[model samples]
Target: KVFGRCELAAAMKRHGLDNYRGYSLGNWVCAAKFESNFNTQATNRNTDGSTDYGILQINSRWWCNDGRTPGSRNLCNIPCSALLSSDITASVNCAKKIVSDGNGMNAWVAWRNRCKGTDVQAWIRGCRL
Candidate 1:
């Protein structure tokens, strides 16, 4: 599922992502824009041999169990495939855990590179919250 910017914003808000851990929903929206373009099925295999899955690109190395990421913490206690589902409930839950676990939004490199210190509200411009 490829979500429009506004649609993703509403979904994230519904899932309690607004101002979570001091990061605004705009930060999350911006991260998703660059990380997976809001595509639920997007996956990226890293050079380190781990894969990132879903809209927020949760990684197999620490979050989800891909059964192949060697030493994966599986902190989310879910299969990496769960992140790829269009429903997004699991993905959103896992992401919340990631932030609450103290990693914050910087857990995503895309957020660091593209969203950090930027005016992220533009990412969801005109979206009714």
Candidate 2:
């Protein structure tokens, strides 16, 4: 599923991503914009034989199990495919786990480069969340 900016913002907020780990809703929305463009099925294979899945792009290396990423911890205890579902519940849950693991939003390099230190309010403006 491809979500518009506001749509994605609402969903993330609904999932309690807003201010999770002290990051704003806009920060989460901005990361999604750069990570997967709000596409639920987005996936990116990494050079280290791991992969990123779903909107927040949870990684196979340390999060989900893809059965291919060597030494995968699967700390999220879910299959990588679960992250691709349009429901987004699993994706959001895993993302929360990532943030709670002390990585915060820095888990995604996209967020670090694009959303960090920027005024991200525009990402959630008029979303009515």
Candidate 3:
């Protein structure tokens, strides 16, 4: 979470994801800010009995595994721990699959619940990216 906006933007840019599926870099950055406060290792238990993973808070129900739990789709195919690491390739790739499915930012409840209708640009304001 100590990582800054420019750094996050730089990484997203490096992955060729700064503007994916019409979503802006600021959209991604702001979602990360609220989803996990940019903490890759963060985990949250949902009321629906699923665990959300990583900076994007992808759900164990469809994206990543919740080890010892059966019936998770784990569509990402990578270990849930991979999403928790500082290396984000797996998380980013998985997110792309999700967005490409036409979910848009709607895949993220945090974006809907918190980032919608807000000044997302503020999440990256003053960053040198």
Candidate 4:
């Protein structure tokens, strides 16, 4: 809802996403911006490099569940692809997981912010942003 639809699709495509959607992309992009400022390949010593390259800022160590570089086609890559189909349900659920874990959009939210016209939490069924 925050992204509407067009914005989301743009963000995904801009980031090399094969998926296509309008609304879902918007919200997901919002979430990404609000999280990591849309900085893909963003990395910091959270704890001795245990967490590798953060796409969408998903701890590669956890989501990938393996000790490897968190790049495209990695565990964190699934969310971006999912949104391509306008599957808001899955995208939102994934975003919820990150929010629950204390990780904001980071990538999705960042995308939303720079995706032209987007408003965070605008899609919330019941709330005021």
Model 1 agreement with the true structure over 67-112: per-residue lDDT tens digits:
9988777989999999999888999999999888766877888899
Which of 1 and 4 is the better model by TM-score? 1
lDDT of 1: 0.91
lDDT of 4 by residue, 38-115 (tens): 444344444534443333445444443333434423333453334323333434444445544553333343453564
User: All candidates' lDDT scores?
Assistant: 0.91, 0.91, 0.80, 0.42
In model 2, which range of ten residues has the least summed lDDT? 99-108
- Alpha-carbon deviation at 62 in model 4, angstroms: 2.0
Residues 7-113, candidate 3: write the lDDT tens digits. 88778767867789987788888888888788888888887777888888888888887784456688888777788888778778988988887778888878887
Q: What lDDT tens digits, residue by residue, belong to model 2 across residues 6-119?
A: 998889889999898899899999999999999999999999989999999889999999999988889989999999998989998889899888778888899999999999
C-alpha RMSD (angstroms) for model 3 = 1.6
C-alpha positional error of residue 76 in candidate 3 after TM-score superposition, expressed in Å:
1.1
Kindly indicate the candidate among 2 and 4 with the higher lDDT: 2
In candidate 3, stretches whose alpha carbon ends up further than 4 angstroms from where it belongs are none
List the candidate numbers ranked by TM-score, top first.
2, 1, 3, 4
* Candidate 2 segments exceeding 4 Å error: none
True lDDT of residue 13, candidate 1: 94
Backbone clashes per model, in order? 0, 0, 0, 24
